[PDB]
């Protein structure tokens, strides 16, 4: 129930892929070169352009009947601009030095490749991804 | 040769209740209300009004078959809130909105000479 | 059936409220699944519908002869001049809730014919009706309160299903049934049996 | 009624599986309707002018 | 081949078929008239004696 | 009753109408099309018969067809198109419609799946809502020719624990496919669970289509000006090539294929060139059409249609073949009176260069009518031939049955096979599987 | 360049039933044949004296209507005077799945 | 390589992994000798002909030769330990499920 | 009880009587509608 | 002599689907004819459901005669048969 | 305040207005009740005493059923199935008589005005045939030749369009919202340009055209529904909408009463 | 034609070999021609295969032809059905064609063959030969209106007098 | 026979204007579309209902009965 990954990613290129509502954006971390992330984003709700810096975080705290907030007093990790829910379904090793994790946010594909420091990610259904512009 | 009774669509049959409320075991504080001899007209409006209420959690209306004039509304609210009270509040709000709309339409028609 | 070899049986009857309505409030008299068009290669039906819409809007009867000089582009241009979508697509609204349909609906008048084949005269049911004197089996023909025929292909299909009991009942209980006496030495049905 | 009054029949038996007579020859152009014809055993034998 | 391999049946009905998305895979709609004409010989038992009496 | 699955047990549901009503899927095993088809209902008259029908021949038990050891009955054209549209990555559903779809599923557990998008607003993807119908514990992993983990086109299919990880559902996934979702669900869960899944998917897809809508029209069959120009240019190039080949043949400069005579070789070459031109025109039309096109979307769904249908509707009808050859000279060296003698040009030999959209010239119309008549006669004769063949096969194989010693014997007791299919396994349970030992190199096998 | 003869109009090659089909060329030939076969079974006014005609089986359409798009050969066939069918507003869509 | 076969081992393995929640981190509890013995017992337990004679036993072994080859190809020590990470309980469950499915897949006597 | 197809005049003939119209030679001899009350609904 | 002893039976011990259907039908027919019921009924009246419950509890006293093509038959009690379905 | 009505235009049997601050479901339900749930008076039973026209008794009865009838005081009238009466009492039905016959060489045209009310309306302006044509003849019913006598009685009962379309008080109820594609509810089918292919709707002038600069408004909801109600003639459009609202409110009140009783 | 052959590396490789197709059927002498591979020589006509190679070779050729014709249109049928068909067509010494001159000429039940095209001739033949029918066939039981030894009817159901007492 | 009382699609009453339609076509010699527009038929459903109708009642009345 705490943040596991947090980074700043600059988008190298955006490919609509024939989908007007959804697009695919590939970005690289501004701190670690080996860290890369290619994610499907619903540009209609969260428009994204090339050469844009986005703060991407992964949290495990927002069966499990979903409920509306039903009140403005309720607060959580909502200090972002685009929050999605997905499930990890694949972990692979590249060059015996990098780890790539695959997430499926309701049919939106994401692949995040990084160093061994990304071991916090686990093959669990509970996985929230938040992006701040 | 055996077409359905057209009047029976909107007329209650012998020994038939207009509303049938039963509990739902799928989720806590969930109820199923079967409306007889009713169409999408009332079900959709009631469900839309219910969804506009913060306390109401789930409100879904289903028509089993076009042949039978009947539908089922599944309503689930928060703990300590009786679904029947939520339905009554939604119906009262619908009545108030309809009355306000009627008054506005009457005033507009009276204002216009034509 | 339309005038293009399309034969259809009504699936459900909806009142004018339930059926979708166009932006002008027009509720179609008929709704046809689009899947009938591609497989049947019946492109003429859509062109006929477009021409009928153009004629109705203009009021002048349209010429639908085979080798007419007019083309689809001209009909679409006329329809556009009549304040409608060129290709005949029209925005429609769901009658159940009023939500606009995500995909626009091809719409317009078209000629249809009611074939003599009707269910009222094509529905039959038998329950121990009259039987032919020759074989003591159900007579043929619904008008004469006949019975259905258990075909040989149906027989082998049931044999494949393995329902031996069903076949025995169908061919010995639901059909002609007789009880006959046979000797244990000559094995011939010619046995004098006074039950009384 | 109009189609029936202008109908043509072929004495060849409705049975058999010889497609050649059933097929309409190129000579039918302008004399026999290419499309109007029954479907089934009688197909290719009953012709409408 | 006309009366032994294939023979007419008493308890059976025939009629047109129409699609119905609101029916289960193993569930088939049946006209009320056909249901009335077609019958099943259920034997009287204590378990359903009341139901059979009501049907009668 | 062409096949075994043409007679199945159904549970009666009394309705106030004079027409039998059955599930959409069961149309496929019955080969029904609701264009006036009349079916028969037989009521059992004993407890034995009722039990045998319920346990031996029941629709849930008949899903897997022993004829091709794959599910013969699957999703239907309209439901297939609806589910394909629903599963698109760009398809998002509002809270109201999501709740209604969840309620429609009779066996819905009761917990609302969490939205795929949270901060903007609660949105559920089509895959998430569809997964509720799929029971938990279902794993499917199909990769097409160009399918990877990050499938750019959303091709293939990956479903884990009853949740659709990704992929667009089509006929190869949920339709009558050996490795499809239906087959694996039946093998793992069972027949009743498979029937429940069919019902849930059909209801959800029908509701989504009703609240979404789908249609087809004239504009779908029309292509932009550049596409028509390219198609015309390709047709002209094909005609020029055919003319050059004919001129070469006239000057006896063409070498006839070995064995095949000169006339037959020339006819085969012309037919091949015309078919290639028609295929190129169809490909140009298909690439011209976009995903928004209704006909293209339906064809991609796999519900019906094909490349030939689109090509003929928008690009080119193509050559008309009668008796496996072009239109013969019915008159004296003339296909039609409008052509002079010794006219071997494609237009005079049954070739149609105009699609149904633009129309057909009277000669093209007559050639198409001849082709249609040939097809109708072929069907009318082949149906009877196939029925007679099936009758003979059934009579020959009527007495063969498998006994408790796992030997297929006839009435006389002669052993046709000491083992049923040389395996003794049930036809339905058989499924296509890959053997790793056969494939792979020596180094791969070692490692 | 000779063309000793010419057709008055190609559409006349069609028969009585085929001519009723709008744009037969735009449609596939098997569909045209099916339409021609089915047209004989369409219910409509067959004669104006059906009141006095004691036919074995007669079907009369309540409100016969002429098609919006009629082939020029229909007037010769007098189909407009005795139409068999009606013009209905068709929507090509899968609304309820029925 | 793709041919008809009675039961899909891949689906059984996937179901076992999903239900038992096999983790690639913890070392597998399986043993080479244990795996070999389990595979041999599974192969011997598959019966399509049951007769206490040489002819019937030979026929039974011949009938299931292809399926035995499939099991050896799939239930290999390298694959079980390298490609898969099944544990003792998971491996036993997989063996039992494979045996049960194979027995169910046997042709039902009396089928036409 | 009966009317003529052409004359459309009542005859009221009885049994064992000629079925030919008295006014003309035509013998269609149509019958008038029943006097029993008849009711119809627009449904 | 044709009858085979209880042991040394070459037939499959597992219950066959045809055998299960036949046993269910026979049990339902017997129950419908006021036959004794060996399993307590918890508000159940459908003969088929009662037969299914009896088969699940292996309370059905019926037998199966596996008939070989030659003529020999093997007896199998319902209790010993294994129901995979 | 609640929802307000802005009547863009009004006419004798056609009113176009705008509804604001109203949910889409509420507007759809209002349209449904207005098209189906509004009580109306129409001919239900037809008794034939002497008919010899070329037409058929069922045909003419069906034609008569569709004939509009005045229903301004329909609320005062009670359903026949409700009141305790033997058959079509004056308190629950309206009785009219149709009489006609041809002559030497002039065909007799039967119109709505030919119907004559025979029952006692007790001073209620209900059941009168609706006449709107300039000539004033009414709805043509049939044509009688010399010697063709038409004589029948018509009984009209209170009813709703759901039981039969003849009771429909409104012919076409146009309902539109979101002229400009602001909510992305519809994906316009386009081949070259979506804007060019699809002409702008008439109501588009009443809303600000969208600006490409701003992003999509995901919080926007359906609002400002343009509704045009046309009346067949039995009830004026204003009274049509008023009665539809009344019927919907009565149905909701009946639901509440059932809930309270149960 | 490209043939899949074991490459030295162990993985199947495509070898573009040459194959000769002939419009005649004279396998007896063609297979004797030196310079070809008689082991893999195949003939379309299964009759020649049976005459030259043997009954098993004829059955294999018939099965391959059936598979080819079935798969010509793309339809797939399980191998077991084709194997059973070829076995029944070859269960006898030679190849029994599926006609009134083939399996219908066997010594099966008289009534079973009666249901085929030949109806009264078979009855006369049985009368002359006094043929005995064991009524083990489907047609015999169907005509007699009795439960055939098929699936449910293959076995019989009895009552245990010892288990019933304890079950009570 | 006679013009339908109400439009099949929407239900608008169209039987009143059939005589007016004929008068406009004959007396004023106006085109079909202009006459229909003058009568007050906007939706093409009523337009095709009026335009496509055939007066078979007159033909039936041509007979003596
Ligand atoms: Mg059909
Ligand atoms: Zn007279
Ligand atoms: Zn009263
Ligand atoms: Zn209208």
Alpha helix positions (H), F213-325: 218-221, 225-250, 262-288, 294-301, 307-310
Residue that the structure tokens 């005038």 belong to: C3
Q: Are B67 and B4 in contact (CB under 8 A)?
A: yes
Q: Are M52 and G72 in contact (CB under 8 A)?
A: no
Q: What is the C-alpha to C-alpha distance for residues F222 and F17, in angstroms, rounded to an integer?
A: 42
Instruction: Collect all residues of chain C within an 8 Å Cβ-Cβ radius of residue L151.
Output: 161-164
SS3 assignment for J15-27: CCHHHHHHHHHHH
Both tokens assigned to L73: 């249109």
Residue that the structure tokens 């004469």 belong to: C144
Q: What is the C-alpha to C-alpha distance for residues M48 and G63, in angstroms, rounded to an integer?
A: 13
Which chains have 3 or more CB–CB distances shorter than 8 Å to chain C?
Answer: B, E, F, G, H, J, K, L, M
Both tokens assigned to C71: 């083309």
CB atoms within 10 A of CB K2: 14
CATH at residue M30: 1.10.10.60
Which residues does chain K break after (C to N > 2.5 Å)?
none
SS3 assignment for K70-127: EECCCCCCCCCCCCCCCCCCCCCEEEEEEEEECCCCCCEEECHHHCEECCCCCCCCEE
Cα distance between the two ends of chain C: 63
CB atoms within 10 A of CB K181: 16
Question: Which of E40, E37, F12 is closest to C127 using CA atoms?
Answer: E37
Q: Are K58 and I38 in contact (CB under 8 A)?
A: no
Is C49 one of the annotated binding-site residues?
no
Question: What is the C-alpha R_g of chain C?
Answer: 29
Instruction: Collect all residues of chain G within an 8 Å Cβ-Cβ radius of residue M51.
Output: 68
Would you mind telling me the total number of residues written for chain G in this entry?
Answer: 98
Instruction: Collect all residues of chain K within an 8 Å Cβ-Cβ radius of residue A45.
Output: 216, 218
The SS3 assignment for F115 reads coil
The SS3 assignment for I14 reads coil
CATH topology (fold) of J1-85: Eukaryotic RPB6 RNA polymerase subunit (3.90.940)
User: Pairing between strand C124-126 and E12-19?
Assistant: antiparallel
Q: What is the C-alpha to C-alpha distance for residues F302 and F78, in angstroms, rounded to an integer?
A: 10
Burial B83-113 (b: 16+ CB within 10 A, else e): bbebbebbbeebbebbebbbebbeebbeeee
Q: Do C52 and G67 touch (CB under 8 A)?
A: yes
Question: Which of H4, H109, H111 has its CB closest to that of L78?
Answer: H4
Q: Are C155 and E5 in contact (CB under 8 A)?
A: yes
Dihedral sign for Cα atoms in the order D4, D5, D7, D11: positive
CB atoms within 10 A of CB C151: 14
For residue M43, report the distance from its CA to the centre of ligand 4, in Å. 6
Closest listed ligand to the CA of K95: 3
Q: Are K227 and K18 in contact (CB under 8 A)?
A: yes
- CATH tag for F216-361 (out of 2.40.50.100, 1.10.132.30, 3.40.50.720, 3.30.1490.20): 1.10.132.30
Q: Tell me which residues have their CB within 5 A of the ion that is ligand 3.
A: K 80, 83, 85, 89, 92
Burial (0-12, 13-18, 19+ Cβ within 10 Å), F401: buried
The CA-based angle H49-H53-H59, given to 5 degrees, is 40
For residue F27, report the distance from its CA to the centre of ligand 1, in Å. 11
Q: Are H111 and L150 in contact (CB under 8 A)?
A: no
Query: Number of structural domains, chain B?
Result: 1
Q: Are A14 and A24 in contact (CB under 8 A)?
A: yes
Which chains have 3 or more CB–CB distances shorter than 8 Å to chain G?
Answer: C, D, E, F, K, M
Which residues does chain A break after (C to N > 2.5 Å)?
62
Query: Which chain F residue has the Cα nearest residue E18?
Result: F21
Element at L124 (helix H, strand E): helix L120-129
SS3 assignment for chain A: CCEEEEEEEEEEEEECCCCCCCEEEEEEECCCCCCEEEEEECCCCCCCCCCCEEEEEEECCCCCCCCCCCCCCCCCCCCCCEEEECEEEEEEEECCCEEEEEEEECCEEEEEEECHHHHHCCCCCCCEEEEEC
Question: Which of K6, K7, K13, K10 is closest to K234 using CA atoms?
Answer: K13
The SS3 assignment for H15 reads helix
Burial (0-12, 13-18, 19+ Cβ within 10 Å), H76: middle
Experimentally, how was this structure solved? cryo-EM
Q: Residue K214 to residues C122, F351, K185, K218: CA-CA distances in angstroms?
A: 62, 54, 18, 12
Contact status of C165 with chain J (Cβ, < 8 Å): yes
| DSSP structure class, residue H91 | H
CB atoms within 10 A of CB A13: 11
Query: Which chain F residue has the Cα nearest residue G11?
Result: F362
Q: Are L98 and F392 in contact (CB under 8 A)?
A: yes
CATH topology (fold) of I1-43: Rubrerythrin, domain 2 (2.20.28)
| DSSP structure class, residue F275 | H
Q: What is the C-alpha to C-alpha distance for residues B80 and F412, in angstroms, rounded to an integer?
A: 76
The domain spans of chain I are: 1-43
Dihedral sign for Cα atoms in the order K98, K103, K108, K114: negative
For the packed helices J47-57 and J17-32, what is the interaxial angle rounded to 10 degrees?
Answer: 120
Burial (0-12, 13-18, 19+ Cβ within 10 Å), I2: middle
Q: Are J55 and J24 in contact (CB under 8 A)?
A: yes
Question: Which of C33, E23, E18 is closest to F38 using CA atoms?
Answer: E18
Question: Which of H46, H60, H50, H55 is closest to H99 using CA atoms?
Answer: H46
Both tokens assigned to K40: 């109306």
Instruction: Collect all residues of chain L within an 8 Å Cβ-Cβ radius of residue F403.
Output: 154
For residue F36, report the distance from its CA to the centre of ligand 1, in Å. 6
| DSSP structure class, residue G27 | B
CB atoms within 10 A of CB A70: 13
Q: What is the C-alpha to C-alpha distance for residues B68 and B61, in angstroms, rounded to an integer?
A: 15
The SS3 assignment for L165 reads helix
Q: Are J44 and J53 in contact (CB under 8 A)?
A: yes
Closest listed ligand to the CA of M13: 4
Q: Do M13 and K171 touch (CB under 8 A)?
A: yes
Question: Which of C31, C8, C12, C11 is closest to C92 using CA atoms?
Answer: C31
> What residues 316-345 of chain F have any CB closer than 8 A to a CB of chain D?
322-323, 327-331, 335-337
SS3 assignment for chain M: CCCCCECCCCCCECCCHHHHHHHHHHCCCCCHHHHHHHHCCCCHHHHHHHHCECCHHHHHHCCCC
Which string of DSSP letters, residue by residue, matches F406-436? S-EE-TT--EEESSGGGT-B-TTT-EEEE-T
- CATH tag for C131-196 (out of 3.40.50.1820, 3.90.1800.10, 3.30.1600.10, 1.10.4160.10): 3.90.1800.10
CB atoms within 10 A of CB L14: 11
Question: K228 to chain M, minimum CA–CA distance in Å?
Answer: 13
Question: J23 to chain L, minimum CA–CA distance in Å?
Answer: 8
Q: Are K209 and K9 in contact (CB under 8 A)?
A: no
CATH 3.30.830.10: does it fit domain F63-215? no
**Which residues have a Cβ under 8 Å from the Cβ of E40 and sit 6 or more positions away?**
F43, F44, F45
Q: With DSSP H G I counted as helix, E B as strand and the rest as coil, what are the percentages for chain H, rounded to 5?
A: 65, 5, 30
User: Pairing between strand C148-150 and E7-9?
Assistant: antiparallel
Q: Are G92 and C106 in contact (CB under 8 A)?
A: yes
Q: Do C165 and J18 touch (CB under 8 A)?
A: no
Dihedral sign for Cα atoms in the order E27, E32, E38, E40: positive
Element at K172 (helix H, strand E): strand K170-176
The CA-based angle C48-C51-C52, given to 5 degrees, is 85
Q: How far is CA C164 from the centre of its chain?
A: 33
| DSSP structure class, residue B12 | P
Q: Do L158 and J75 touch (CB under 8 A)?
A: yes
A7 is in which domain, residue-wise? 1-133
Q: Are E45 and F49 in contact (CB under 8 A)?
A: no
Residue that the structure tokens 């009287």 belong to: E44
Identify the residue among C56, C66, C92, C99 best suited for mutation to test binding to G, counting G beta carbons within 10 A and taking the highest.
C66
Q: Residue L118 to residues C155, L96, L100, L102, L110: CA-CA distances in angstroms?
A: 20, 17, 7, 12, 11
Phi and psi for I20 in degrees, rounded to 5?
-95, 145
Query: Number of structural domains, chain A?
Result: 1
Question: C158 to chain H, minimum CA–CA distance in Å?
Answer: 10
Size of interface C-M (CB pairs under 8 A): 46
Are I and C neighbours with ≥3 CB pairs closer than 8 A?
A: no
Q: What is the C-alpha to C-alpha distance for residues G58 and G46, in angstroms, rounded to an integer?
A: 8
Q: Are B9 and B37 in contact (CB under 8 A)?
A: yes
Both tokens assigned to F230: 């390219």
Q: What is the C-alpha to C-alpha distance for residues C166 and C150, in angstroms, rounded to an integer?
A: 12
Q: What is the C-alpha to C-alpha distance for residues F37 and F30, in angstroms, rounded to an integer?
A: 10
Residue that the structure tokens 């494939």 belong to: F439
Phi and psi for K257 in degrees, rounded to 5?
-65, -40
Q: Do M10 and C29 touch (CB under 8 A)?
A: no
Instruction: Collect all residues of chain K within an 8 Å Cβ-Cβ radius of residue M22.
Output: none
Which string of DSSP letters, residue by residue, matches chain C? -BTTS----------TTTS-EETT----SEEE-TTHHHHHTBHHHHHHHHHHHHHHHH-SPEE--TT-S--HHHHHHHHHHTTS-TTSEE-EE-TTT-PBPSB-EEEEEEEE--BS--GGGS-EEESS--B-TTTSSBPS-TTTT--EEE-HHHHHHHHHHT-HHHHHHHHHTSS--------SSS--S-------
Both tokens assigned to E42: 């259920």
Contact status of C124 with chain B (Cβ, < 8 Å): no
**Which residues have a Cβ under 8 Å from the Cβ of C196 and sit 6 or more positions away?**
none
Structural domains in chain K plus CATH codes: 1-39+166-262 (3.30.1360.10), 40-165 (2.170.120.12)
Alpha helix positions (H), chain K: 24-32, 57-65, 194-197, 237-261
Q: What is the C-alpha to C-alpha distance for residues A130 and A128, in angstroms, rounded to an integer?
A: 7
CATH 2.40.240.20: does it fit domain F1-62? no
Q: What is the C-alpha to C-alpha distance for residues F73 and F30, in angstroms, rounded to an integer?
A: 9
**Which residues have a Cβ under 8 Å from the Cβ of I2 and sit 6 or more positions away?**
I10, I11, I12, I13, I29, I30, I31, I32
Q: What is the C-alpha to C-alpha distance for residues M2 and M58, in angstroms, rounded to an integer?
A: 9
Q: What is the C-alpha to C-alpha distance for residues K247 and K255, in angstroms, rounded to an integer?
A: 12
Q: Taking phi first (over 0 means left), then psi (-120 to 50 degrees means alpha), and beta for anything else, what does residue F160 get?
A: beta
């Amino acid at each position: 129930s705490n943040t596991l990954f947090d980074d700043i990613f600059q988008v190298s290129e955006v490919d609509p892929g024939r989908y007007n509502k959804v697009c695919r954006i590939e970005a690289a971390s501004t701190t670690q070169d080996q860290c890369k992330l290619t994610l499907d984003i619903n540009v209609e709700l969260f428009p994204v352009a090339a050469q844009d810096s986005l703060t991407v975080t992964i949290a495990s705290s927002l069966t499990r009947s979903w409920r509306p907030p039903q009140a403005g007093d309720r607060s959580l990790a909502d200090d972002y601009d685009y929050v999605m829910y997905g499930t990890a379904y694949k972990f692979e090793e590249v060059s015996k030095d990098l780890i790539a994790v695959y997430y499926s946010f309701g049919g939106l594909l994401m692949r995040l490749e990084g160093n061994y420091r990304n071991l916090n990610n686990l093959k669990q259904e509970n996985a929230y991804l938040l992006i701040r512009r | 040769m055996n077409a359905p009774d057209r009047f029976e669509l909107f007329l209650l049959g012998e020994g038939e209740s207009k509303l049938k409320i039963d509990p739902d075991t799928k989720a806590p504080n969930a109820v199923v209300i079967t409306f007889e001899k009713e169409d999408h007209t009332l079900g959709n409006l009631i469900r839309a009004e219910l969804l506009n209420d913060r306390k109401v959690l789930f409100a879904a209306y289903k028509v089993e078959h076009p042949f039978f004039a009947r539908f089922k509304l599944r309503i689930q609210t928060t703990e300590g809130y009786d679904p029947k009270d939520a339905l009554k509040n939604a119906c009262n709000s619908i009545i108030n909105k309809l009355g306000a709309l009627k008054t506005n339409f009457e005033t507009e028609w009276n204002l216009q000479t034509l | 059936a339309s005038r293009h070899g399309q034969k259809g049986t009504i699936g459900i009857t909806y009142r004018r409220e339930d059926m979708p309505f166009t932006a002008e409030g027009i509720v179609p008299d008929l709704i046809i699944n689009p899947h009938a068009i591609p497989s049947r290669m019946t492109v003429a039906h859509l062109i006929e519908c477009l021409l009928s819409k153009v004629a109705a809007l203009s009021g002048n009867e349209g010429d639908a002869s085979p080798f007419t000089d007019i083309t689809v582009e001209g009909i679409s241009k006329l329809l556009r001049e009549h304040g409608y979508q060129s290709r005949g697509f029209e925005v429609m609204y769901n009658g159940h809730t009023g939500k606009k349909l995500m995909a626009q609906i091809f719409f317009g008048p078209t000629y249809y014919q009611r074939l003599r084949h009707m269910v009222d005269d094509k529905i039959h049911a038998r329950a121990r009706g009259p039987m032919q004197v020759l074989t003591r089996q159900p007579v043929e023909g619904r008008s004469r309160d006949g019975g259905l025929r258990f075909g040989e292909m149906e027989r082998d299909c049931m044999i494949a299903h393995g329902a031996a009991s069903f076949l025995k009942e169908r061919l010995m209980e639901a059909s002609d049934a007789f009880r006959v006496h046979i000797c244990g030495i000559c094995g011939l049905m010619t046995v004098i049996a006074k039950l009384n | 009624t109009l189609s029936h009054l202008r109908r043509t029949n072929t004495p060849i038996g409705r049975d058999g599986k010889l497609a050649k007579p059933r097929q309409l020859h190129n000579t039918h152009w302008g004399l026999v309707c290419p499309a109007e014809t029954p479907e089934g055993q009688a197909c290719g034998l009953v012709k409408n002018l | 081949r006309g009366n032994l391999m294939g023979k007419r049946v008493d308890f059976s009905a025939r009629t047109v078929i129409s699609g119905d998305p609101n029916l289960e895979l193993d569930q088939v709609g049946v006209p009320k008239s056909i249901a009335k004409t077609l019958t099943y010989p259920e034997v009287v038992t204590p378990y359903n004696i009341d139901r059979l009496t009501q049907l009668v | 009753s062409l096949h075994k699955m043409s007679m199945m047990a159904h549970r009666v549901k009394v309705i106030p109408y004079s027409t039998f009503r059955l599930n959409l899927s069961v149309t496929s095993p019955y080969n029904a099309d609701f264009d006036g088809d009349e079916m028969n209902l037989h009521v059992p008259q004993s407890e034995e018969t009722r039990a045998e029908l319920s346990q031996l021949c029941a629709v849930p038990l008949q899903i897997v067809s022993p004829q091709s050891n794959k599910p013969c009955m699957g999703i239907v054209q309209d439901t297939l198109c609806g589910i394909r549209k629903l599963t698109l990555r760009d398809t998002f559903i509002e809270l109201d419609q999501v709740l209604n779809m969840l309620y429609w599923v009779p066996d819905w557990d009761g917990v609302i799946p969490t939205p795929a998008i949270i901060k903007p607003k609660p949105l559920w993807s089509g895959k998430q809502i569809l997964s509720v119908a799929i029971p938990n514990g279902i794993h499917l992993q199909r990769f097409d020719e160009g399918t990877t983990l990050l499938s750019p086109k959303d091709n293939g299919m990956l479903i884990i624990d009853g949740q659709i990880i990704f992929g667009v559902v089509e006929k190869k996934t949920v339709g009558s496919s050996n490795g499809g979702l239906i087959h694996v669900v039946t093998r793992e869960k069972g027949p009743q669970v498979c029937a429940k899944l069919f019902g849930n998917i059909q209801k959800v897809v029908n509701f989504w289509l009703l609240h979404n809508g789908f249609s087809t029209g004239i504009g779908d069959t029309i292509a932009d000006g550049p596409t028509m120009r390219e198609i015309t240019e390709t047709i002209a190039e094909a005609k020029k090539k055919v003319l050059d080949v004919t001129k070469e043949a006239q000057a006896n400069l063409l070498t006839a294929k070995h064995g095949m005579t000169l006339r037959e070789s020339f006819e085969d070459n012309v037919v091949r060139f015309l078919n290639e031109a028609r295929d190129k025109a169809g490909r140009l039309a298909e690439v011209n059409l976009k995903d928004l096109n209704n006909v293209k979307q339906m064809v991609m769904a796999g519900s019906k249609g094909s490349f030939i249908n689109i090509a003929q509707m928008s690009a080119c009808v193509g050559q008309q073949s009668v008796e496996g050859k072009r239109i013969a000279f019915g008159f004296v060296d003339r296909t039609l009176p409008h052509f002079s003698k010794d006219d071997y040009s494609p237009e005079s030999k049954g070739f149609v260069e105009n699609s149904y959209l633009r129309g057909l010239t009277p000669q093209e119309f007559f050639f198409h009518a001849m082709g249609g008549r040939e097809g109708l006669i072929d069907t009318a004769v082949k149906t009877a031939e196939t029925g007679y063949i099936q009758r003979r096969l059934v009579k020959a194989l009527e007495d063969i049955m498998v006994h408790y010693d796992n030997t297929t014997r006839n009435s006389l007791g002669n052993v046709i096979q000491f083992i049923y299919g040389e395996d003794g396994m049930d036809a339905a349970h058989i499924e296509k599987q890959s053997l790793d030992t056969i494939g792979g190199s020596d180094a791969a096998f070692e490692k | 360049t000779t063309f000793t003869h010419c057709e008055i109009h190609p559409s006349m090659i069609l028969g009585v039933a085929a001519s009723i089909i709008p744009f037969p060329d735009h449609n596939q030939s098997p569909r045209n044949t099916y339409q021609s076969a089915m047209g004989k079974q369409a219910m409509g006014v067959f004669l104006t004296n059906y009141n006095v005609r004691m036919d074995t089986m007669a079907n009369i359409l309540y409100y016969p209507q002429k098609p919006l798009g009629t082939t020029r050969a229909m007037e010769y066939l007098k189909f407009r005077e005795l139409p068999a069918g009606q013009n209905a507003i068709v929507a090509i869509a899968c609304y309820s799945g029925y | 390589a793709n041919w008809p076969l009675p039961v899909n081992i891949r689906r059984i393995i996937q179901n076992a992994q999903q239900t038992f929640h096999i983790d690639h981190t913890k070392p597998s509890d399986l043993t080479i000798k244990d795996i070999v013995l389990g595979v041999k017992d599974l192969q011997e337990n598959l019966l399509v002909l049951r007769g206490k004679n040489e002819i019937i036993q030979n026929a039974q072994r011949d009938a299931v030769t292809l399926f035995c080859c499939l099991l050896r190809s799939r239930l290999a020590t390298r694959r079980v330990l390298q490609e898969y990470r099944l544990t003792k309980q998971a491996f036993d469950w997989v063996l039992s499920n494979i045996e049960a499915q194979f027995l169910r897949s046997v042709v039902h006597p009396g089928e036409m | 009880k009966y009317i003529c197809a052409e004359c459309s005049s009542k005859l009221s003939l009885s049994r064992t009587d000629a079925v030919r119209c008295k006014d003309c030679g035509h013998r269609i001899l149509l019958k008038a509608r029943t006097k029993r009350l008849v009711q119809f609904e627009a449904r | 002599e044709k009858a085979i002893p209880k042991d040394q039976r070459a037939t499959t011990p597992y219950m066959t689907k045809y055998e299960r259907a036949r046993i269910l039908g026979t049990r339902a027919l017997q129950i419908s004819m006021n036959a004794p019921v060996f399993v307590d009924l918890e508000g159940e009246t459908d003969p088929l459901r009662i037969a299914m419950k009896e088969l699940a509890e292996k309370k059905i006293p019926l037998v199966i005669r596996r008939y070989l093509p030659d003529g020999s038959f093997e007896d199998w009690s319902v209790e010993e048969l294994i129901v995979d379905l | 305040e609640g929802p307000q009505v802005k009547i863009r235009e009004a006419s004798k049997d056609n009113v176009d207005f705008i509804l604001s601050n109203v949910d889409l479901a509420m507007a759809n339900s209002l349209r449904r009740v207005m098209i189906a749930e509004i009580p109306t008076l129409a001919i239900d039973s037809v008794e034939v005493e002497t008919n010899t026209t070329v037409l058929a008794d069922e045909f003419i009865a069906h034609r008569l059923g569709l004939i509009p009838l005045q229903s301004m005081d329909i609320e005062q009238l009670e359903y026949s199935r409700d009141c305790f009466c033997e058959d079509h009492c004056d308190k629950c039905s309206v009785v009219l008589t149709l009489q006609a016959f041809g002559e030497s060489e002039s065909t007799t045209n039967v119109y709505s005005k030919d119907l004559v009310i025979v029952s006692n309306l007790m001073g209620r302006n209900i059941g009168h045939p609706i006449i709107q044509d300039k000539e004033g003849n009414g709805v043509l019913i049939c044509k009688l030749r010399k010697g063709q006598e038409l004589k029948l009685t018509c009984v009209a009962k209170k009813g709703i369009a759901k039981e039969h379309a003849k009771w429909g008080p409104a012919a076409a109820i146009e309902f539109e919202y979101d002229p400009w594609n602001k909510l992305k509810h519809t994906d316009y089918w386009y081949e070259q340009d979506s804007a060019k292919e699809w002409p702008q709707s008439k109501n588009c002038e009443y809303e600000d055209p969208p600006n490409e600069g701003d992003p999509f408004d995901y919080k926007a909801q359906a609002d400002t529904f343009y509704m045009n109600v046309e009346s067949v003639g039995s009830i004026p459009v204003d009274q049509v909408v008023v009665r539809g609202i009344d019927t919907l409110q009565k149905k909701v009140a009946s639901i509440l009463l059932a809930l309270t009783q149960m | 034609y490209d043939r899949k052959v074991p490459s030295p590396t162990g993985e199947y490789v495509k070898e573009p070999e040459w194959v000769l197709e002939t419009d005649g059927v004279n396998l007896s002498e063609v297979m004797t021609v030196p310079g070809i591979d008689p082991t893999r020589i195949y003939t379309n006509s299964f009759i020649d295969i049976m005459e030259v190679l043997g009954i098993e070779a004829g059955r294999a050729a018939l099965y391959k032809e059936v598979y080819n014709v079935i798969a010509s249109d793309g339809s797939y049928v399980n191998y077991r059905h084709m194997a059973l068909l070829v076995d029944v067509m070859t269960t006898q010494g030679g190849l029994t064609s599926v006609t009134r001159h083939g399996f219908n000429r066997s010594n099966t039940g008289a009534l079973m063959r009666c249901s085929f095209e030949e109806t009264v001739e078979i009855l006369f033949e049985a009368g002359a030969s006094a043929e005995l029918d064991d009524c083990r066939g489907v047609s015999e039981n169907v005509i007699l209106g009795q439960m055939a030894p098929i699936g449910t009817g293959a076995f019989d159901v009895m009552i245990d007098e010892e288990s019933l007492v304890k079950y009570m | 026979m006679i013009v339908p009382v109400r439009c099949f699609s929407c239900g608008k009453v169209v039987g009143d204007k059939w005589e007016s339609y004929l008068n406009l076509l004959q007396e004023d010699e106006l085109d079909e579309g202009t006459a229909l527009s003058r009568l007050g038929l906007k939706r093409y459903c009523c337009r095709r209902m009026i335009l496509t109708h055939v007066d078979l009642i007159e033909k039936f009345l041509r007979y003596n009965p």
